[PDB]
Amino acid sequence: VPATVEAVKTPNSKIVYDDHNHERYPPGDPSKR
Amino acid sequence: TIRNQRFSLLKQPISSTLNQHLVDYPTPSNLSYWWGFGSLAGICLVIQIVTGVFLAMHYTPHVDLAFNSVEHIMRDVEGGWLLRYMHANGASMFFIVVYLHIFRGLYYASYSSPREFVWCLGVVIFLLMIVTAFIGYVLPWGQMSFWGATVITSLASAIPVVGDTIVTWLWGGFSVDNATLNRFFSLHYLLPFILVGASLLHLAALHQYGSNNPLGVHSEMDKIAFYPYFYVKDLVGWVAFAIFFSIWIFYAPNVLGHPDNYIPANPMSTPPHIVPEWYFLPIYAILRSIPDKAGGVAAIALVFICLLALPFFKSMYVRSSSFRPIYQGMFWLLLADCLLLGWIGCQPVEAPFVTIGQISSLVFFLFFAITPILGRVGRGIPNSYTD
Amino acid sequence: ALTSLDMPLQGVSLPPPLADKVEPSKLQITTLPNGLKIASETTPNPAASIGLYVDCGSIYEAPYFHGATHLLERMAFKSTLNRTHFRLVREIEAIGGNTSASASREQMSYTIDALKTYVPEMVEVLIDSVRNPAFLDWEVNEELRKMKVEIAELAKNPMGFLLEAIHSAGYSGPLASPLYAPESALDRLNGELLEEFMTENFTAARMVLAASGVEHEELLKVAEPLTSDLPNVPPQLAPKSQYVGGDFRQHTGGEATHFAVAFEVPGWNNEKEAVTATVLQMLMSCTAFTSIFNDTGLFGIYGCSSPQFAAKAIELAAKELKDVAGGKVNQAHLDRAKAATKSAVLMNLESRMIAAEDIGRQILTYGERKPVDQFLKSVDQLTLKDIADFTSKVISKPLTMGSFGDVLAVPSYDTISSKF
Amino acid sequence: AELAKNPMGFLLEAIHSAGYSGPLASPLYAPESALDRLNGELLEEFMTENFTAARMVLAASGVEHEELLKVAEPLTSDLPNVPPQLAPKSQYVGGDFRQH
Amino acid sequence: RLVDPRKNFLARMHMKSVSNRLRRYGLRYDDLYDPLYDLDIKEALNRLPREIVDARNQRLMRAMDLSMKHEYLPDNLQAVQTPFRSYLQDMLALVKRERAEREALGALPLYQRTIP
Amino acid sequence: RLVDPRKNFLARMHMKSVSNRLRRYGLRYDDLYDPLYDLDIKEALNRLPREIVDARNQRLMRAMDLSMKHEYLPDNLQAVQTPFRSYLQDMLALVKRERAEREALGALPLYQRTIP
Amino acid sequence: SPPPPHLMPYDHAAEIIKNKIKKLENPDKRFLKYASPHPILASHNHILSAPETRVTTLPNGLRVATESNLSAKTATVGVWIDAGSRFESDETNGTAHFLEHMIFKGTDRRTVRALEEEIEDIGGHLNAYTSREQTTYYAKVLDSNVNQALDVLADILQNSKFEEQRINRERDVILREMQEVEGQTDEVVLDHLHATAFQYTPLGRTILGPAQNVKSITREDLQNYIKTHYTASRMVIAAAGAVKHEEVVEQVKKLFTKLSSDPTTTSQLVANEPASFTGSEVRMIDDDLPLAQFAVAFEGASWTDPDSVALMVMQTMLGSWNKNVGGGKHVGSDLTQRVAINEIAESIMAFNTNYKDTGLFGVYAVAKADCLDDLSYAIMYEVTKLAYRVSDADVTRARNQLKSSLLLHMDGTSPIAEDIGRQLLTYGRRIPTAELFARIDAVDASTVKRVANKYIYDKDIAISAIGPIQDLPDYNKFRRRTYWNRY
Numbered sequence A: 001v002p003a004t005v006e007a008v009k010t011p012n013s014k015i016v017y018d019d020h021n022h023e024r025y026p027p028g029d030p031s032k033r
Numbered sequence B: 001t002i003r004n005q006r007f008s009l010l011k012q013p014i015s016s017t018l019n020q021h022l023v024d025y026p027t028p029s030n031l032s033y034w035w036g037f038g039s040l041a042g043i044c045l046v047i048q049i050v051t052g053v054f055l056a057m058h059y060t061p062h063v064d065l066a067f068n069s070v071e072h073i074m075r076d077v078e079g080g081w082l083l084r085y086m087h088a089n090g091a092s093m094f095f096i097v098v099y100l101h102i103f104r105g106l107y108y109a110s111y112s113s114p115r116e117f118v119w120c121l122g123v124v125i126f127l128l129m130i131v132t133a134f135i136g137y138v139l140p141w142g143q144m145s146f147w148g149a150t151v152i153t154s155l156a157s158a159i160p161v162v163g164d165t166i167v168t169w170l171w172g173g174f175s176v177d178n179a180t181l182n183r184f185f186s187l188h189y190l191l192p193f194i195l196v197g198a199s200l201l202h203l204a205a206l207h208q209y210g211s212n213n214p215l216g217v218h219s220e221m222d223k224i225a226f227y228p229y230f231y232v233k234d235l236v237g238w239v240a241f242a243i244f245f246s247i248w249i250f251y252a253p254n255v256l257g258h259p260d261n262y263i264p265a266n267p268m269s270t271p272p273h274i275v276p277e278w279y280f281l282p283i284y285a286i287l288r289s290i291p292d293k294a295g296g297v298a299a300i301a302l303v304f305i306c307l308l309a310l311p312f313f314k315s316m317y318v319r320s321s322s323f324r325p326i327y328q329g330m331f332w333l334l335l336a337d338c339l340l341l342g343w344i345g346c347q348p349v350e351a352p353f354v355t356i357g358q359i360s361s362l363v364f365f366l367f368f369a370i371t372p373i374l375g376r377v378g379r380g381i382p383n384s385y386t387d
Numbered sequence C: 001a002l003t004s005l006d007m008p009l010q011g012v013s014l015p016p017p018l019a020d021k022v023e024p025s026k027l028q029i030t031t032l033p034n035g036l037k038i039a040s041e042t043t044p045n046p047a048a049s050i051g052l053y054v055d056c057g058s059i060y061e062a063p064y065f066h067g068a069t070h071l072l073e074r075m076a077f078k079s080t081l082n083r084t085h086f087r088l089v090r091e092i093e094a095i096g097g098n099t100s101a102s103a104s105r106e107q108m109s110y111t112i113d114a115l116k117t118y119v120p121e122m123v124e125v126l127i128d129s130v131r132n133p134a135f136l137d138w139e140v141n142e143e144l145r146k147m148k149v150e151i152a153e154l155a156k157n158p159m160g161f162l163l164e165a166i167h168s169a170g171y172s173g174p175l176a177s178p179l180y181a182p183e184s185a186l187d188r189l190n191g192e193l194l195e196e197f198m199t200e201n202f203t204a205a206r207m208v209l210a211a212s213g214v215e216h217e218e219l220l221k222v223a224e225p226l227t228s229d230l231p232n233v234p235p236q237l238a239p240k241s242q243y244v245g246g247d248f249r250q251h252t253g254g255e256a257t258h259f260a261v262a263f264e265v266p267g268w269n270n271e272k273e274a275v276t277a278t279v280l281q282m283l284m285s286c287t288a289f290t291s292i293f294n295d296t297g298l299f300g301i302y303g304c305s306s307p308q309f310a311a312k313a314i315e316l317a318a319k320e321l322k323d324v325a326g327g328k329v330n331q332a333h334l335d336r337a338k339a340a341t342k343s344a345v346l347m348n349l350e351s352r353m354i355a356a357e358d359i360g361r362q363i364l365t366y367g368e369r370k371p372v373d374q375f376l377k378s379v380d381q382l383t384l385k386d387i388a389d390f391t392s393k394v395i396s397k398p399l400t401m402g403s404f405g406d407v408l409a410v411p412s413y414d415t416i417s418s419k420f
Numbered sequence D: 001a002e003l004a005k006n007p008m009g010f011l012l013e014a015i016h017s018a019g020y021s022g023p024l025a026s027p028l029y030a031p032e033s034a035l036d037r038l039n040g041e042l043l044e045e046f047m048t049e050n051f052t053a054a055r056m057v058l059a060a061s062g063v064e065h066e067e068l069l070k071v072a073e074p075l076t077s078d079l080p081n082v083p084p085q086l087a088p089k090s091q092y093v094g095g096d097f098r099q100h
Numbered sequence E, F: 001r002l003v004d005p006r007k008n009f010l011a012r013m014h015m016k017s018v019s020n021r022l023r024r025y026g027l028r029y030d031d032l033y034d035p036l037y038d039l040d041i042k043e044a045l046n047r048l049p050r051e052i053v054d055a056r057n058q059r060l061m062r063a064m065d066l067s068m069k070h071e072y073l074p075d076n077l078q079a080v081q082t083p084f085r086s087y088l089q090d091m092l093a094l095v096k097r098e099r100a101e102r103e104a105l106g107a108l109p110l111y112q113r114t115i116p
Numbered sequence G: 001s002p003p004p005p006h007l008m009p010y011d012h013a014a015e016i017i018k019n020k021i022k023k024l025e026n027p028d029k030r031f032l033k034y035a036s037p038h039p040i041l042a043s044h045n046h047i048l049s050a051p052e053t054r055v056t057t058l059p060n061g062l063r064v065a066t067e068s069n070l071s072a073k074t075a076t077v078g079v080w081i082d083a084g085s086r087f088e089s090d091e092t093n094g095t096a097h098f099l100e101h102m103i104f105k106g107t108d109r110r111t112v113r114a115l116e117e118e119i120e121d122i123g124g125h126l127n128a129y130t131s132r133e134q135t136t137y138y139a140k141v142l143d144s145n146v147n148q149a150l151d152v153l154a155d156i157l158q159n160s161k162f163e164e165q166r167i168n169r170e171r172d173v174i175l176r177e178m179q180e181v182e183g184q185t186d187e188v189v190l191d192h193l194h195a196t197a198f199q200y201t202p203l204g205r206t207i208l209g210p211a212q213n214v215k216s217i218t219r220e221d222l223q224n225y226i227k228t229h230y231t232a233s234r235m236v237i238a239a240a241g242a243v244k245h246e247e248v249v250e251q252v253k254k255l256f257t258k259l260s261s262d263p264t265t266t267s268q269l270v271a272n273e274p275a276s277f278t279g280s281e282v283r284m285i286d287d288d289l290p291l292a293q294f295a296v297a298f299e300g301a302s303w304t305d306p307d308s309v310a311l312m313v314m315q316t317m318l319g320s321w322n323k324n325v326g327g328g329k330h331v332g333s334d335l336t337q338r339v340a341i342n343e344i345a346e347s348i349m350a351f352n353t354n355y356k357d358t359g360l361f362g363v364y365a366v367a368k369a370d371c372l373d374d375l376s377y378a379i380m381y382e383v384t385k386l387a388y389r390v391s392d393a394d395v396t397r398a399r400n401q402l403k404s405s406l407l408l409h410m411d412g413t414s415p416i417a418e419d420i421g422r423q424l425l426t427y428g429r430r431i432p433t434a435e436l437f438a439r440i441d442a443v444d445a446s447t448v449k450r451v452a453n454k455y456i457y458d459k460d461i462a463i464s465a466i467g468p469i470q471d472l473p474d475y476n477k478f479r480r481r482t483y484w485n486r487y
C-alpha cells in the first residue's frame, strides 16, 4: 500500500510535524495570537 | 462558476491585473534571500526618482551656478543635506543591489532558456543605469565632473570617419562647457523614466515563465503566492537595506566618493588622480588595459556583446551551480576577477598594475569563452555517469 | 437564557402533559360539488402535514406530452400568478415549512409540512401553487437544464435504471411511457406545453386534499373558497395498458452485469393477491422488488454478477422462483415473512408524512381509506398452498427481463423464458 | 461517436450483436469502456497470436510472379509453422435491438 | 573519453561530487532536465509512462520542500537513493533522432518554441 | 399629464421628431436600450424570446451599416417602420419590480455590476 | 403601411410575452391573505403538549425513561450507554466498535441463529450504533413484544459469549472494511477533521481504530471493556410507543442484575483526559478525484454550555443546500444564496457538533476544482459576518426554522427513544419542548453577535480537504478571513 493511500485511509491523531525550523508548543495550549 | 454577484474586491476588474501580477502570482516556495534584490533595485530606483525630483527644485544647470546651487542645497535648503546624501549614496546603493542581482543570475544560470529575453532586457537596463549615473555625476560640475565628462564624450573619436564629428555634436561645441552640462541635465531627467519603463518590461517578461529557483528545476508542483510569503521575506531585506543605507547617509556620507569633486571644475588644471565612481571602475579598468584607443572602445562593447550572447549559447540542460561544480568554481573565479578589476581601476597606470589589468581582463573574457564549450562537454554527462 | 443546559430555565410556562392514552381521531371526508375530495384527521403531534394528490402521471402523456410529468414535479412551488418564486420560498421559510413534490407513473403529489398553527398559510400556498402556476419561460428552462443532469446521473444507479427499464420492456401502451423522458422530448418541452397538459389533467374530480394534524372545520373554511370554483368535469376512463412481456439489453461495458427478471401480479384493485405479492417480496445490489399499480403490478428480483459469472446467476434466481412455486418453503420461513410484512406496514405508519400520503394515496385509488386491520387479516390468513399456487400462476405467464452493463455473456430471452 | 449518424451501419451491427450469441456477436466497434484497456502491449500479444503465415495471403494484381517472389520470399520465409486452428463456431438465434 | 569515470580519476571525482549533491535531495540527474528548457524535453516527457512522470514530480516536490526548509534527506533515505538511474535520456535521444530526420527530409517541425 | 402627446402639443412635436429620427435608421425606441448600460436591461433581454432578440440584433446591424455609409433607409422601407412598437418596457418593469421585492426583504441581489 | 402587430413572427412573439406579463400584474387576492414573507416570532405553547416523559432511577443507578403512547401499535426499546471511543485508551482503541460487532454473536441462552430467528419470528429489528462518546442498542418491535425485546437486550449485554473463532471471523470482517469501504468520502473528511482538530486527545481517535489494535483484540479485552464502561450509573433504558412505565421498570429490575457497579462518572474520565482544539489542517491532494470535498471548523460549545443553543441558531442561519434543491437562490440564508446564485458548489452544509467539554462548528462543502477559490471566500465571508451584521429578520427566521425542525423530526417511536436516551446522557434530563423553545427565543441579534465574537472572530480553524484542492486557499488565507479590518 502506497504511503499517501494509507495516510488517507487511516486518520492519525498523533501527528508529528517537522521541527528543524520551528518547535511546536505543547498540544492543548492557548493560541499565541 | 457564473459571476452573477461580486466576490472578493481584488478579483473585480478594477484590481484584477494587480491581484494577478503582484498579489496572487505563483512563486517557487524555495526562493532564497538572493531572490529579494530585484525588489530592492526597484525601491532604489524609486528613491532616486523621488529625491532627484525634489533636488531638481533647487539645482541650477549652468556652469556659473551649478557648483554653488549644490552647495546651496547642502547648506540653505531645509533638509537639503539628506536629499543630496540619499541621492548621491542612493546611486551607490542602486549599483550594489543590481550587481548582486546580476551575480545571483549568473550563479543559478537564470539567463538560460526559457528566460533569455529577461536577461537581454536586464543588460539593456544595465546600459541605461550606467548612462544615467554618469551624466548625473557631471551635474555638480566639480573637478571630476568636468574631467570625467571630457573622457567619455571623447570615446566617440575612436570611430575613424565621423568620430570627431560625434564628439563635437555630443559636446555642443569644441570643449566641455555649458551646452554640455545643460544637455546632460535634460537627459538625466528623462532617462530614469525610460528606466522605469524598461524595468516594467523586464518584470513582465519574467512573469511569462515565473522565476527560477535555487535548485534550477521545474517548480510548478511547489509554488505559493507572492503575497504574503515573499512580501514579508522582501520586507526583511527592505528593512536591512534601510539600515545599510542609513549607515552610509548618516555616518559615512562622503567615503564612497572622491574629495576632488568638492573643488569647482577647472578646465586649466587637471587632477593627478582622475577616476570614475567605484561602480564604473571594472569597466574603466578593462578600457585602460588595451594600449590602443580604438581597441579599448571595442573591448568595452565586447563586454556587453558577451553579456547579451550568454543566454543563446548552446549549453547543457542543468541550470544551478549547486549541481555544476566546475561552473561553480568558474563562477567564484569570475567574482574574484571582477573585484580585482574594480581595484585595479582605482590604481594609476604603472607597473605592476598594467599587467595585472591585462591578465584580469583576459580572465573576465575567458569566462564567456569557456562557458559554451562546458555545455557541449556536459551534455554527455548523463550517458557517461550511468547507474 | 443564561443557565447551563442541565439546569431547568426558571420562569417557563409549561403546557400540561397529554394523557398516556389518546383515542385516535376519525378521518373526516368532505366532497365538494365539483368532485374535489377534502380529507383530514386530527392528531396530538404538533406537526401538521397537508398534501394535494392528483390522479395524473406518465400514463397521460403519450404522445406529444412525453416528459410533462417529470417537468411538472420539478416546476413545483415555483412562481404563481399571485406571488413570485422568491416570495413563495420566503413565505414557507418564515413558518419553518418544508415542501415536497412527487411524480409517479399514475400519481402526482404536493406536500407541505409545518407546525399546526400555520394551517391557513400552508393551505393557501399549496393551493395557489397547484392551481395557478405561471410556467414562466426562464424558470422552465432552468428546470429543463437541471433535468438534463439528473437523467445523465441515472445510469450510475442500476437499480433505478433497470426498474425503469423493465417497465417499458414489459408493458405495451401508457405504462411503457418512461417516467424519465429522453433528451429529445426535453428540447420540445415548454411552458405553454405544460399549461395545456395541466389545464386538461388537473381537474377537481381527480384531486384529493389530504391533511394529517388539522381540524376539519377551519381546514374547510380556508380550502373551500380556494377550490369551490373549479369546474365540474366528467371522469375519463384511465388509459389501458397491457402486459406483454419483453426483453431489455444494453451493452455498456464494465465488469458488473446487472439483471432484473420480472413477472406480472395483480394491481391494487384486486383485493388479496396483491397482499401475497408483498409477502412473496419478503419471502425473498441484489434484492426482490415490487411495482404495483391500480390494475396490474410487477414482481421481480435483482442481481449483480461478473462478466463471466453472468450466466448462472440468472438461472440461480430462476431456480428460486421455481422452488417457491414448487412448495419448497417451510412454515418457519413463511411465518417470518408474514411477521416481517405485518410489522413493516405498521412501522411506516407512525410517520405523520407517510400517514398523510396514505390518506391521499387511498382516497385516489379506492375513494376511502381502507383500515390496515383487514390488510393484516389477509396477511395472517395466508397458507403455503396460496404462496405456491400464486407463484405458479405468476411465473407461468410471459416473462420480462432486463440487463445492463456487460450483456455479451447474458443469454437470449428464449433461453431464459423456457426455464420457467 | 459518429456511428449513430449512419442508421444503416448502426442497425447492421446492432442486429449482428442481437442475431448471434458467440464470437459473431462481438461488436466490430467496441464500447468506450472496452477502449480504456487497449494498449500497445495488448495489440502485440493479439497480433503475435493471430497473424501467422498459414493465415496470410499476399495477393498482387498487376505484377510478374518471378519478381514478386524474388522480393517477398526473403521477407516471409522467416515466419514459423503453426499447426492450423479452427475458426470458432457461432450460433444464430433470434433477438431484438431497441434504443429509444 | 576523459569524461569516462572508469578511465579518468578526475571524472570519478566529478561524478562522486554530482551524485553526492543529488543524493542529499533525493533527486535523479534526469530530474534536472526541465520541460521549459527546450521543447524536446517536453516532447520526451510527454512520451513517458504516467507512473514515471508521477514519480519525477513527487521527487521534485520532495526536493523543493527540503530546499525551502533548509533541510536534507535523512541518512536512511539517502542510503536508498539512485541518483544516476535514468528514465529520460533514451527517450530524449529518440526524440532528437526523429527531429533530425524530419529536418533532413525537408519537413516542418512537429513543434516550436513560442517567441518570448 | 404634460408628457402625453394627446394633450401637450409640445410633446406631440417631441414624439414626431424622435419618431422621424428612429424611422430613418429602421430602429425602434427600445433598440436604444443597451444591455451594458444597466444590468436590469440585460436581465430583461435574456428573458425575451430568441426571435425578439434576433430581430433587435438585426435592426441594430442594419442601422450601423446605414450609419457607417452615411445613408438612410429607402423611403419605401421607412413607410413600413414602427418606431414605437414596444417589446422591452413591460419585461424591464417586471425585472425592476422583482429587484425591489428582493431589496425590501433583505435578500441578496440576483446579479451585480462589476466594478470597473 | 406598417405591418399589423401580429404579422411578423417577432412582432407576434413579443405580443405573446407582453400579454403574459400583463396577467402577472393583477394578482387574485383570494390567495394573498394568510401567508406572509416577513418572519414573526410566534409563541404557541398550547400545541406543545406532549405525553409525560416518566423517568425512574433504580437503586443500582440504572435509569428507565419512557414516553407512553398507548394508542400506537409499535414500540422502540433500547439501551443508551455513556461510553464510546473517547473513553478507550491508545491500546484499546477499536474495542468499542469490535464490541458492537460481537454484541449479536452468541450467548449461553441463545446462539447466533437462535437470536436472529427469534427477531424475525416477531418481525423486529435490532440496531447497534457506536460513536466517540455514546453507544446505543435498541429494538424496534410490536407492542405485544416489548418484554421479549427487553429480555434480548439484557441477555446480549450481560451474558455474551465472545467465542474466539467468532472473534477471528469478525476480525477479518473489520480488517476488510477498514481498507475496502473508505469511499464514503464525507465521513472520511470529518474523520480527518477530528484527528487534526483534536490531535493528541482521546476525542481525536477514530471509532474504528487502528489495524494494530484490531488484529490483537482478544476475548478478555472485550470482557474488560464491558466491565469498566457498561456500568449501571452510565446506562439508560429508554422506551417509546405502546409501553407502560411501571411494566418496563419492573422488567428492568428483574433482568439487569449483572451490571458492573463501578461508581465512576463520565465527568471524571473527561476531566482526567480533557479534549482541546488545535488550529491545523490536513490536505489529501488527489487530482484523480472528480470533486473536491473540504470542511472548515471552529472550536464550538459543549452540550451543557448555554451558548450551544445559539450555535444551533447560527447553524440554521448558515443552512444547507445541494444542487437538487429548487429555491436555493431565494432562501433566507445568505451563504446558500451566494452558492446557489453563482453555482459555486455541488452541495454545502453547516454543522454544529457537541461533546462533553468541547465541540465543532463549521461548514462542509463539495465543489469542483475551479470553484474552490470563490467558494472559500463566500464561506468565510458569511461566517465572519455573524460577528458584525445580523439582521433581526434573519435571526427570527432561523429561530422559526429551528423550532419547526426540532419537532417535525420527532415522527416515530425510534427518533423519540433516541431523543430520550441522548438527552438523559448529555443533559441529565429530557428538556421539555416549552423550555427549549424559550432558550431558542432568547437568542436575538445581539446574542448571535456576542456568541460569534467568542467563537469565530480572529480564532484558529481546522481544515480537512481531499481531492483536487490545489486552488483551495492556504491556512493563512482562511485565518485572515476570520476578521474584517474595515471595522
Ligand SMILES: COC1=C(OC)C(=O)C(C/C=C(\C)CC/C=C(/C)CC/C=C(\C)CC/C=C(\C)CC/C=C(\C)CC/C=C(\C)CCC=C(C)C)=C(C)C1=O
Residues within 6 Å of the ligand: B130, B131, B134, B135, B144, B147, B148, B149, B151, B152, B153, B170, B187, B274, B275, B276, B277, B280, B283, B284, B287
Ligand atoms: C578617466 O576617464 C574615465 C572616466 O572619468 C573619470 C570615467 O568616469 C569612466 C567611467 C564611465 C563610464 C563607464 C560611462 C561610459 C559609457 C557610456 C555609455 C557613456 C554614457 C553616454 C553618454 C554620455 C552619451 C549621451 C547620449 C546622447 C547625448 C544621445 C543624444 C540623442 C538623443 C537624446 C536622441 C537622438 C535623437 C534622434 C534619433 C532624433 C529623433 C528623436 C526623437 C525622440 C523623436 C571611464 C571609463 C574613464 O575612462
Ligand code: HEM
Residues within 6 Å of the ligand: B034, B035, B036, B037, B038, B039, B041, B042, B045, B098, B101, B102, B105, B108, B110, B111, B115, B118, B119, B121, B122, B123, B125, B126, B199, B202, B203, B206, B210, B211, B212, B213
Ligand atoms: C533597475 C534594475 C533592475 C530591476 C528593478 C530588476 C527587477 C527584477 C525583479 C523584481 C525580478 C524578480 C524578482 C527577483 O528575482 O529578484 C527580477 C528578476 C531577474 N532579473 Fe532583474 N532587475 C534589474 C536589473 C537586472 C539586470 C541588470 C539583469 C541582468 C543583466 C537582470 C536579470 C534578471 C534575471 C535573469 C531575473 C530572473 C532571475 C530568476 O528567475 O532567478 N535584472 N529583476
Ligand code: HEM
Residues within 6 Å of the ligand: B045, B048, B049, B050, B051, B052, B053, B055, B056, B059, B070, B084, B087, B088, B091, B094, B129, B132, B133, B136, B137, B138, B139, B140, B188, B189, B190, B192, B193
Ligand atoms: C528623474 C529622476 C532623477 C532626477 C530628477 C535627478 C536629478 C538629479 C539632480 C538635480 C542632481 C544634482 C544634485 C546633486 O548633486 O545631488 C543629480 C545628481 C545625481 N544623480 Fe540624479 N536624478 C534622478 C535619478 C537618478 C538616478 C536613477 C540615478 C542613478 C542611476 C541618479 C544618479 C545621480 C548621481 C550619481 C548624481 C551625482 C550625485 C553627486 O555627486 O552629488 N539620479 N540628479
Ligand SMILES: COC1=C(OC)C(=O)C(C/C=C(\C)CC/C=C(/C)CC/C=C(\C)CC/C=C(\C)CCC=C(C)C)=C(C)C1=O
Residues within 6 Å of the ligand: B021, B022, B023, B025, B026, B027, B038, B039, B041, B042, B043, B045, B046, B196, B199, B200, B201, B203, B211, B226
Ligand atoms: C512573483 O513576481 C513578483 C516578483 O518576483 C518574484 C517580485 O519581486 C515582486 C516585488 C518586486 C517588484 C514589484 C519590483 C518593482 C517593479 C518594477 C517594474 C521595478 C521598477 C519599478 C518602479 C520604479 C515603479 C515605478 C512605477 C510606477 C510608480 C507606476 C505607477 C503606479 C502607481 C503610482 C501605483 C512582485 C510584486 C511580484 O509579483
Ligand SMILES: [Zn+2]
Residues within 6 Å of the ligand: G097, G101
Ligand atoms: Zn462495523
